[PDB]
Design a protein around this ligand. Sequence first.
Ligand SMILES: N[C@@H]1CCN(c2c(F)cc3c(=O)c(C(=O)O)cn(C4CC4)c3c2Cl)C1
Ligand SMILES: N[C@@H]1CCN(c2c(F)cc3c(=O)c(C(=O)O)cn(C4CC4)c3c2Cl)C1
Ligand SMILES: [Mg+2]
Ligand SMILES: [Mg+2]
Ligand SMILES: [Mg+2]
Ligand SMILES: [Mg+2]
Ligand SMILES: [Mg+2]
Ligand SMILES: [Mg+2]
Lengths: 482, 482, 208, 209
Amino acid sequence: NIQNMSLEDIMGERFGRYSKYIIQDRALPDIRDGLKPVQRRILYSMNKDSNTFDKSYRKSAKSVGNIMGNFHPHGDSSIYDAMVRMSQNWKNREILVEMHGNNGSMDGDPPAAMRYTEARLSEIAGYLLQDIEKKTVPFAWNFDDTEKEPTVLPAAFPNLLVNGSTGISAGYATDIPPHNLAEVIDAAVYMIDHPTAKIDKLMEFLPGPDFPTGAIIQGRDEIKKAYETGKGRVVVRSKTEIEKLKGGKEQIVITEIPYEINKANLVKKIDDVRVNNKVAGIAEVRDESDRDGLRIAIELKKDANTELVLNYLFKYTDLQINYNFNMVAIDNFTPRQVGIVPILSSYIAHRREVILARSRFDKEKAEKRLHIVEGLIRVISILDEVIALIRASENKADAKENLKVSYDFTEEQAEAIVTLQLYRLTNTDVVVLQEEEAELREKIAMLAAIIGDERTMYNLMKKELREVKKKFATPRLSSLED
Amino acid sequence: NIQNMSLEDIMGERFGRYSKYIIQDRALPDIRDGLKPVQRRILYSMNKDSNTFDKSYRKSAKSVGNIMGNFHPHGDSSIYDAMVRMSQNWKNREILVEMHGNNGSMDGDPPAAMRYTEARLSEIAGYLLQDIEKKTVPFAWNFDDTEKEPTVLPAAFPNLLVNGSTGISAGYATDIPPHNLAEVIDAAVYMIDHPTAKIDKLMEFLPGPDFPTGAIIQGRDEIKKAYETGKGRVVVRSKTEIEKLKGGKEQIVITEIPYEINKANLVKKIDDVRVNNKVAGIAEVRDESDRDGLRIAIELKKDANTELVLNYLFKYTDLQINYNFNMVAIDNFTPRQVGIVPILSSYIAHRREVILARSRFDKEKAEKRLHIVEGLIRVISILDEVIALIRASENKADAKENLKVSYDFTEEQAEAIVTLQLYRLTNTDVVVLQEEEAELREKIAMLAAIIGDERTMYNLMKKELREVKKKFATPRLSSLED
Amino acid sequence: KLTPAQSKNPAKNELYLVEGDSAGGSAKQGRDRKFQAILPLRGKVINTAKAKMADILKNEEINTMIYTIGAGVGADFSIEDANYDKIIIMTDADTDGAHIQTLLLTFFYRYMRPLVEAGHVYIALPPLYKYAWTDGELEELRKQLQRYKGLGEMNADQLWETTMNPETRTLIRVTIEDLARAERRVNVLMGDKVEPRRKWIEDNVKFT
Amino acid sequence: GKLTPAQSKNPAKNELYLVEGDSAGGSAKQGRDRKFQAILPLRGKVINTAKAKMADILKNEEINTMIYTIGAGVGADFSIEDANYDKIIIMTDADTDGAHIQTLLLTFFYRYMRPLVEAGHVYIALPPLYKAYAWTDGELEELRKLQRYKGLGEMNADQLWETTMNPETRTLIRVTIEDLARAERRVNVLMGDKVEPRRKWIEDNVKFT
DNA sequence: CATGAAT
DNA sequence: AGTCATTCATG
DNA sequence: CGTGCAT
DNA sequence: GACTATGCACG
Ligand SMILES: N[C@@H]1CCN(c2c(F)cc3c(=O)c(C(=O)O)cn(C4CC4)c3c2Cl)C1
Ligand SMILES: N[C@@H]1CCN(c2c(F)cc3c(=O)c(C(=O)O)cn(C4CC4)c3c2Cl)C1
Ligand SMILES: [Mg+2]
Ligand SMILES: [Mg+2]
Ligand SMILES: [Mg+2]
Ligand SMILES: [Mg+2]
Ligand SMILES: [Mg+2]
Ligand SMILES: [Mg+2]
């Protein structure tokens, strides 16, 4: 039967239960790889299934369900809506997912349902997962205890700043705008050398956000404020152009609008000005966006103050908005308001961790084989008595043992020797084996170096960051203005 | 530029396509496995995934997506709906899918969305799929051209009659009622011995339908008409009973009801008869069915004539209804009105192709193997020599030619020998190999018999049809009245 | 429901009758909004031949069609008051797409004969493979693959170039070239009566 | 009617079940004792009564059909005796979100129905975590002498009964407002308009590691 | 008024 | 295959 | 009508 | 996560 609890208690082991999970495991990105768990699971899964940029598209639903039975015990709607986002290029600066089909528009009409679309990781998402198979990142059990999943991706490029994040849990929210890839790399490259770098200097490399929708970002001092405390308010304003039409009438042509802003609503609200005559002079409001460009025409009446109209729209619509930084992320299992420094440093800390692990890993492998090759090179000198011995052996188990005790071989080697196919006995060419013993010695040095020279480690990390840059770098879309 | 089709001809081509497809590939079952293509796909996919009766459950959506991406290019809601049905023990006589959670009820309320449910094949569904790896059924390419699909399953029991179908194509439609597994088998066994059996002898083993809902079936004459032409109209009446009460107040208690009837509507529709007072003196209808029993109690009035109430309920509700046979299925690629005989025959016909295919497969397997074993028994007597000779060989290919030329081993034996791992040279006991040589000839023999002698094949068909019966047999639920 | 063309002009404008919102959405993105409207049809369309002209005027799909085609239906049908110059039917390459084409044509044949006998009713021909339409046009492209399971698995700019672009698209035009052999064709296949049809199927459909 | 009613109208043993989702909603209809147990599926996340306008709160279907199904009316217009159920039980997934829901509901059964809560009438069901069922990771080690329930929805209508709905085999947490004051502060801060007190509360009370 | 993972 | 509503923190 | 695969 | 409407053959 019953057991009583206080209203002051049952609201305690509940809301505190919710809070923690929603914060650690839901709405906030991990500062190192810039991913909320749903997204990281999406990417890990699609990758686990060879569903990548170089292979054919796979039906979205096949993917979605696999995620839901393997890692993300939640809505399939939630999972798909997330997968869809990672694939839309007016929300992501560097899209992680490629989706054949109707995945939406800037007019924000619904993406086709998951039964119609197919999808795969983008090439650059490969880079987020680069070297996962090498024990670089920490894993944990799935909700189900059937499979381990990574807690954070290797992140070969600094995603959390490049793509952005957003952003609503309990007790905290987050908004981090996207940034140009080349620039964020320059930044991190610099700071790899100068750990103790000033925001002012970093900002020579990272001048401010670069939304995928471009436009104009106004507010130098306010960017600094944000890059420094993580909170800041900047202005985002549309790219505008004016066209003198025949009749003395002018026309305002919009060609880029503010991040996160609905082109369809924006046109509506603008025309709703025209129809209420709040400011005077607007004649026709006409969207001319085709499949290969943004173009809104605002045809003003003859003789009408085009500055008064344009400014009216900036203040009273989303033709111009305020974008608020509120950069929060999960450093060390917990939510942290952070600016450009903790971010880049945390990323750098991570790459380091990663590159070390990665290197311990290949070196392990390279060791284990070098050890066997050493074994094999030796057997050749004593092939006859070894076949002889394996002959007089009772069984596999006794042959390894015998091999050891008779000739100093080790388990690892005894095994390799005792599982060679009879036809290996044809070969007697130590010279090919010796070329390999050499190659492996060299490989091991290079790695070992990396592991034990802090500096060596970083130039590698830089070498790699630059390659990422060279391959994926693209031009700014959003202009900056003091 | 535009081409001109005739309305007469465009309509011809288009309806023809739909017609044909929707007939052979949607609404009608294959006469041998009694499965519509989606049903078949579900089962096959689940099986390929090891999502079987013996292994864990599995989020439904995982399965559904896998099905929709490898085999069935249609809505995820169709797939799940069908997957759900196969798992509801009040629609299927012998459920093909087991599902944890909310699959619905006889009350007709909806199942849990596929995000909530998990599922796996039933033990017996296993049997529909038995021997499918063994190249026993014609495969075609999937819509993708990426993977092969079965076109019919092996069917270790005669699903078409046992679980029934239904059934709405174009030009044709189908309705086949469930049947008691044990009896359908008895029927097929007889017809295996007496090919020419006629309906009357047949009905001594297969008296008629056996709805999982149970109840009472009146109409022995129309059952034959059905088993004979394929159409026919039997009668299905609720299992009733009478309890007595205080004040001399009799009660009607219903415990079984007509296949395909919605318990809820049946209850309301009855209770409506009370409200409207369409027949004299009902007290109160009440569904008292709980998780382990069906119970609609119909309480009557103090001076209430129970035998008129009951008879009105039978005539003017679904408390008793007409089940119409309309046994259509797809024999040799086209729709066929078929009776108890064409059905039971095609099943034997099929089981035959299946047992032959399976037997050839296993036979070739044992043969290729016997061959290798013959090889190894020879080696052992010349082990030193063969080792010696390999050692003197140059690469692997040279070893094999040397083996051939010098000891008359065969390509396949040379390969086998030459690719044995060293430790094999320890367990060098021939008496054990000789045992396997024999076990294998015996096996090859028993199988060659089957292939060369129709009677020995049918004798298996029977042995096997009984095991299935012993293993899954159950009592009737529906009782018969002429 | 409908997406208009940015400019009324009953002589140049095209009305795209699309199969389901998802395809109807790829279309809303590929169109030349200046002269191409998009009306998406949600699910299998009502058989105007089997059902009662009563329940027929109660089907939202049909009402939102008689009203946007802007000429009423039946005998009260003002051919001249038409809204669009070309009415185009865009369905998946699949069978159910084929089925719909049927259901629609029967409507346009039965409750708007004038727009059909006027050669105003067209049928888009999406591509099967990827750019080749017929199985033969495929074998050719292998000399000098992605198969399409419906208009919905195609991307917006791909859609335009291949089916919606006037300069680059191939269209069929339903011409009633015999009011007798094109009536006995609709009533057999879409008629209330099932036997005739069961026969027609049995006579013309080769099941191999 | 969104609600599924009890067979016989006895507000003396009649229990009202507030279930999270139609998934478990139905799995709850099926598994119940229909003579005295009603089911009300809560479709969505129950509105925050402490955050929103008493205007908007009333125009919320999920709350209405509770004001109607409870049969007492909210506010001070609350007649704790003209109710319709002895015990009102909140049945949710044994998950994070289920917890969140247990919350939002409570705040409503306190903000706008204090009596029902003070009368020890509101409860909270206790579905199982493992399967031979257990409730805590410690009670599993004792059965080791192995299914894992991801919530009420992946549970079978017969199983949910023997385990959490049967008035004999079940265990119900019984909500009591022990100290009307130290309680008002907790509901007021967690579920309140003010963000900064919540933040601090999480920081001082939630252990991140 | 939105936002985006969640019910 | 869209439509409806709620959380949570922010300007 | 209500069925069950399909839109 | 429920609701909403169609086609098809059949009593
Ligand atoms: N008037 C009703 C109240 C509830 N409701 C909605 C709604 F509008 C949308 C969704 C929805 O998108 C969704 C999903 O899986 O993405 C899941 N659910 C259910 C899990 C709760 C929704 C619900 Cl209940 C509207
Ligand atoms: N305009 C009408 C109103 C009702 N309607 C319906 C409807 F009632 C139910 C379903 C439905 O179950 C379903 C599914 O995948 O199982 C898919 N569809 C869509 C593919 C067509 C449905 C639609 Cl459109 C659309
Ligand atoms: Mg949703
Ligand atoms: Mg503004
Ligand atoms: Mg449906
Ligand atoms: Mg009757
Ligand atoms: Mg299709
Ligand atoms: Mg849950």
